[PDB]
Design a protein around this ligand. Structure first.
Ligand SMILES: Cc1cc2nc3c(=O)[nH]c(=O)nc-3n(C[C@H](O)[C@H](O)[C@H](O)COP(=O)(O)OP(=O)(O)OC[C@H]3O[C@@H](n4cnc5c(N)ncnc54)[C@H](O)[C@@H]3O)c2cc1C
Length: 453
């Protein structure tokens, strides 16, 4: 077990009660460094390990599509942890109040959590630190190389982060040890009731078309750790050979479709990398997939960890801020409101089709995301307004939303983060421009519009 994966958040006197794993980002029982580190310390202190998940008050800022995907995976995880003699406690409310009260009520000895560089997680860390007196650790279980170890600063381009991450791969890309069960079973409601009351509270804000029927189709991605692995096996067996060639064709389903499982932590990226590396296929297709799940996935965590305002105009590069400012007064061709974007009521049928895939499936194709976001910038009153519209529609309807990949992806599309300066245009400046005719020369746009009416 590598000590560079765990970080100390607060020193304190260890209690003689169970080590608590405050699970948040990585919702799985297998291939979880944070859960394995909790079981090791619990073994050394000769005391069982317990798992606590907090159902926050912010679930109403999303939709039913994310509430059911996360909770149905939690029902499966509870059985898996119980088979390992590990009990799960699901609290509801502010984790600054619930975790602090649980630690004192159960005589907790050590508190451990998983790593997330998002602002809402740092808000929870500051609240729980002020209300505990036991040691508090955090473990990077989402990235192969720990986020604080891959780079000590913000990396402005992928060609700089790539050699730093690959040079550390032999040290941090390793097999997972088996989760040892609790020796004996130790000493706050049913998730089915929590999922019933939450969905009832989310029903008025459900996405519907004119016929009152729902828009979201929940049969595209079954949630759970078991379904997460089955999707990864299908990608390696059927789709990985053609990934490098058909990853930029929205009309082909050649992607791995692992993002909803990777967001909620139902499958480990290090596990996906291990199976892909030991699989035999096209080396151009392998290189392309590892570049997405290693370089671009972990540079998104690097962008959120080293830029406090990762969701603001101030985190853009200087060349992009100066360029967008010099075109702030350019007469926009069109200006749509948030409601026109949300309903896909723009003049562009390709953009509207890209939005309908987002509304109906909760997972828009990877290529159309850059078109969907860069057109928001072209048809917004300001770069800041486009940032708010893109983040709102991304986090509300993407099953992988509210994720560092989404903020770094939106920053790349609108602010040129991890990009370079292109030909100067009006309105958009030097930001990389993607036209409607450029998509037609790349893939059958008519087949993609006809699919998402
Ligand atoms: C405007 C915009 C919005 C995005 N919104 C999200 C989002 O809300 N949530 C999210 O997790 N990703 C987002 N992405 C990144 C990317 O689109 C998705 O990761 C990818 O489409 C997920 O589907 P997939 O797993 O089938 O793709 P694959 O090609 O099979 O890639 C597999 C994994 O590699 C990672 N990956 C792939 N592409 C990217 C990328 N461009 N940036 C970062 N990581 C990547 C992802 O973890 C992905 O799950 C966004 C990108 C853009 C440009």
């Amino acid at each position: 077990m590598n000590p560079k994966r765990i970080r100390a958040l607060k020193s304190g006197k260890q209690g003689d009660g169970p080590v608590v794993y405050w699970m948040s980002r990585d919702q799985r029982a297998e291939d979880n460094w944070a859960l394995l580190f909790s079981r090791a310390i619990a073994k050394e202190a000769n005391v069982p390990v317990v798992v606590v998940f907090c159902l926050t008050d912010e679930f109403l800022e999303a939709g039913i599509r994310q509430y059911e995907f996360m909770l149905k995976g939690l029902q499966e995880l509870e059985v898996s942890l119980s088979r390992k003699k590990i009990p799960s406690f699901f609290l509801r409310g502010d984790p600054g109040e619930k975790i602090s009260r649980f630690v004192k009520d159960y005589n907790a000895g050590t508190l451990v959590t998983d790593f997330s560089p998002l602002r809402i997680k740092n808000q929870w860390i500051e609240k729980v630190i002020s209300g505990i007196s036991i040691p508090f650790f955090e473990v990077d279980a989402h990235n192969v190389v720990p986020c604080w170890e891959a780079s000590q600063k913000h990396e402005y381009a992928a060609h700089t982060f790539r050699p730093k991450l690959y040079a550390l791969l032999p040290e941090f890309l390793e097999e997972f040890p088996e989760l040892e069960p609790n020796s004996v079973t130790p000493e706050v409601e049913t998730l089915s009731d929590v999922l019933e009351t939450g969905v009832k509270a989310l029903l008025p804000e459900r996405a519907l078309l004119k016929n009152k029927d729902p828009l979201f189709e929940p049969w595209h991605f079954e949630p759970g750790e078991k379904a997460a692995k089955k999707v990864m096996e299908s990608f390696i067996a059927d789709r990985l050979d053609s990934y490098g060639a058909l990853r930029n064709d929205p009309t082909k389903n050649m992607l791995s479709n692992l993002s909803p499982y990777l967001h909620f932590g139902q499958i480990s990226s290090q596990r996906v990398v291990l199976e892909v590396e030991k699989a035999e296929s096209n080396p151009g297709s392998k290189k392309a997939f590892l570049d997405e799940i290693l370089i671009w996935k972990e540079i998104s965590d690097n962008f959120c960890y080293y830029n406090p305002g990762y969701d603001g105009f101030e985190s853009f590069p200087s060349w992009a801020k100066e360029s967008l400012n010099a075109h702030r007064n350019d007469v926009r061709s069109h200006i749509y409101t948030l409601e026109e974007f949300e309903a896909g009521k723009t003049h562009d049928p390709l953009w509207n089709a890209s939005q309908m895939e987002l509304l109906s499936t909760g997972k828009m194709h990877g290529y159309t995301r850059m078109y969907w976001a860069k057109k928001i910038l072209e048809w917004s009153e300001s770069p800041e307004k486009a940032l708010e519209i893109a983040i709102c529609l991304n986090d509300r309807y993407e099953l992988d939303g509210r994720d560092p990949n989404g903020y770094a992806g939106i920053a790349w599309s609108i602010g040129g983060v991890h990009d370079r300066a292109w030909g100067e245009r009006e309105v958009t400046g030097k930001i990389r421009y993607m036209s409607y005719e450029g998509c037609k020369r790349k893939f059958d746009v008519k087949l993609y519009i006809e699919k998402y009416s």
